[PDB]
Amino acid sequence: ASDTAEKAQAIAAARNTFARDNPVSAGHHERARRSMPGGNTRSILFHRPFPLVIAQGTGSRFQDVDGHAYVNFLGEYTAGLFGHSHPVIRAAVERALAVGLNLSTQTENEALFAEAVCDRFPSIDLVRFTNSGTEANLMALATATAITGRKTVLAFDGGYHGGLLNFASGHAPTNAPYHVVLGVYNDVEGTADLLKRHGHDCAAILVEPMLGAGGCVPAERAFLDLLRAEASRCGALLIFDEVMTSRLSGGGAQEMLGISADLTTLGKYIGGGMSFGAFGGRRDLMERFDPARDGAFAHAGTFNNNILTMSAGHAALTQIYTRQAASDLSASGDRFRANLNRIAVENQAPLQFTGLGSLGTIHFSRAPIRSAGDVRAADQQLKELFFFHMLRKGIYLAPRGMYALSLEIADAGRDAFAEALADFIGEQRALL
């Protein structure tokens, strides 16, 4: 996928149309720049020429400050599973307020939520709550390094484990300075080599069962089988980062695969749209945090047990996104992704959607997408054009071309997405 002047000119024109369409968002951006770096507090939300500012949303719909309406296919990078105004989440928030905020003590609600997590995730015997997936993964590494007394962590290029463990572009100088060795996702022979070299000092292997932010790239069974066998052989803890993949069945990727990680990290939708993360796993590892134990590890955090997350999360798992709901949404998402790919094939379009269940990302290539290198080698210019095209069609998804279907997406939204994809292929024929 080589950059062309024609594609760059098309991007320039699309950015210009977006800018002309959205002068109020542009004004907001100039003001926001005065208080936050680049008017930004979450890097992924920025895109050129400037990001949209949204005024309000209900269900699957939102409206920008210029008055334009969209269907939200982004769904908060998988956290926004309930849409913008779910009545059961609202009711949980109301119940939480009636219990009381900042009670400075435990409530029964945290235990009920923990039970709901333990009931449905087959390798989580005990769990602790954090305030983000970033904290969950940090605590999983804290656990593995403290238990094993080892320092080396095996992770994968393209892997994303939060703001301090971001390997989406390889090593980053802002990452917490764990001794991380990066392998290639899905590369069996290369990873086997790394584990022979490093296994002796390996505290943990940290891996998503599908690269999420890194392109909705499913792990192959052979790759995960290697990690499970070698973690056990060398005495490293296998950590499955299921922050995104947990939604894929009642029991996440582990239920689907019949493979158990030693620790599992969770985040995003499970707190019902409230701040949330969790790390859990084997009883004998997690019991090291029992505060009554001699030599207990400490896991602090002011908002860990906050009543809003405990209430909304329990509702999310037991009242809304039940195990059957997870199966249904994943089957719905599979049919959706298949339809998009069918549209590509029918039109001889050099593009595909990868992913699992209700999660997907477009890639402008028909080569196998198996690692971060494959994702990067696909056409990035067409990817940007696709984002702006979908916006003009009233469809909002990630700038990077990822959707994550919420429970509020229905036939009308799915049809509109499919139609807009067909229109993109037609209108951009010269560039494809």
DSSP conformation letters of 118-167: HHH-TT-SEEEEESSHHHHHHHHHHHHHHHH---EEEEEET-B-STTSB-
**How near is the Cβ of 342 to its own copies at its closest, in Å?**
27
Q: Tell me: does residue 77 bind its own copies (CB under 8 A).
A: yes
CB under 8 A, 24+ apart: contacts of 166-169 = 168/213, 168/214, 168/372
Q: Which of 66, 85, 328, 422 binds its own copies (CB under 8 A)?
A: 85
Q: Which amino acid is at 382?
A: L
Q: Which of 161, 228, 370, 383 binds ligand PLP (CB under 6 A)?
A: 161
**Of 105-113, 190-198, 254-262, 413-421: span binding its own copies (CB under 8 A):** 105-113
**How near is the Cβ of 4 to ligand PLP at its closest, in Å?**
32
Q: Is 148 annotated as a binding residue?
A: no
Q: Which of 1, 54, 181, 416 binds its own copies (CB under 8 A)?
A: 54
Question: Cβ neighbours of residue 12 under 8 Å, at least 6 residues apart?
Answer: none
Q: Tell me: does residue 137 bind ligand PLP (CB under 6 A).
A: yes
**Of 48-56, 155-163, 289-297, 315-323: span binding ligand PLP (CB under 6 A):** 155-163
Cα separation values, 215 from 185, 335, 374, Å: 12, 19, 9
Q: Which is nearer to its own copies, 8 or 111 (CB)?
A: 111
Q: Which is nearer to ligand PLP, 351 or 404 (CB)?
A: 404
Question: Cβ neighbours of residue 291 under 8 Å, at least 6 residues apart?
Answer: 298
Q: Tell me: does residue 215 bind ligand PLP (CB under 6 A).
A: no
Say which entry of ligand PLP, its own copies, none residue 177 contacts (CB below 5 to 8 A, set by partner kind): its own copies
CB-count burial class (<10 Å; 0-12, 13-18, 19+) for 295: exposed
Compute the chain's Rg from CA coordinates.
Answer: 22
Say which entry of ligand PLP, its own copies, none residue 208 contacts (CB below 5 to 8 A, set by partner kind): ligand PLP
Q: How far apart are CA 328 and CA 324, in angstroms?
A: 6
Q: Tell me: does residue 79 bind its own copies (CB under 8 A).
A: yes
Q: How far apart are CA 159 and CA 178, in angstroms?
A: 15
Q: Which is nearer to its own copies, 8 or 97 (CB)?
A: 97
Cα separation values, 90 from 115, 379, 406, Å: 22, 42, 16
Say which entry of its own copies, ligand PLP, none residue 196 contacts (CB below 5 to 8 A, set by partner kind): none
What is the size of the binding site for its own copies (CB under 8 A)? 117
Q: Which of 302, 324, 411, 430 binds ligand PLP (CB under 6 A)?
A: 302
Q: How far apart are the first and last CA of the chain?
A: 11
Q: Is 245 annotated as a binding residue?
A: no
Q: Is 400 annotated as a binding residue?
A: yes
Binding mask 247-286 for ligand PLP (x = CB under 6 A): --------------------xx--------x---------
- Helix locations, 199-259, DSSP H: 221-234, 252-257
Give the rounded distance of the alpha carbon of 185 from its chain centre.
Answer: 17
**Of 10-18, 141-149, 230-238, 382-390: span binding its own copies (CB under 8 A):** 141-149
- The 10 Å CB-count burial string (b at 16+, else e) for 350-368 is bbbbbbbbbbbbbbbbeee
Cβ count near 105 (within 10 Å): 7
- Helix locations, 185-257, DSSP H: 188-198, 221-234, 252-257
Using CB under 6 A as the binding rule, the residues of this chain from 225 to 244 that contact ligand PLP are 241, 243-244
Q: Which of 18, 73, 82, 160 binds ligand PLP (CB under 6 A)?
A: 160
**How near is the Cβ of 351 to ligand PLP at its closest, in Å?**
23
Q: How far apart are CA 413 and CA 404, in angstroms?
A: 13
DSSP state of 360: E
Q: Which of 212, 250, 252, 273 binds ligand PLP (CB under 6 A)?
A: 212
Binding residues, by number, are 42, 133-134, 268, 301-302, 400
Binding residues for pyridoxal 5'-phosphate, by number, are 133-134, 302
Binding residues for 2-oxoglutarate, by number, are 42, 268, 301, 400
* Contacts with ligand PLP, residue ranges (CB under 6 A): 77, 132-134, 137, 160-163, 208, 212-213, 241, 243-244, 267-268, 277, 301-302
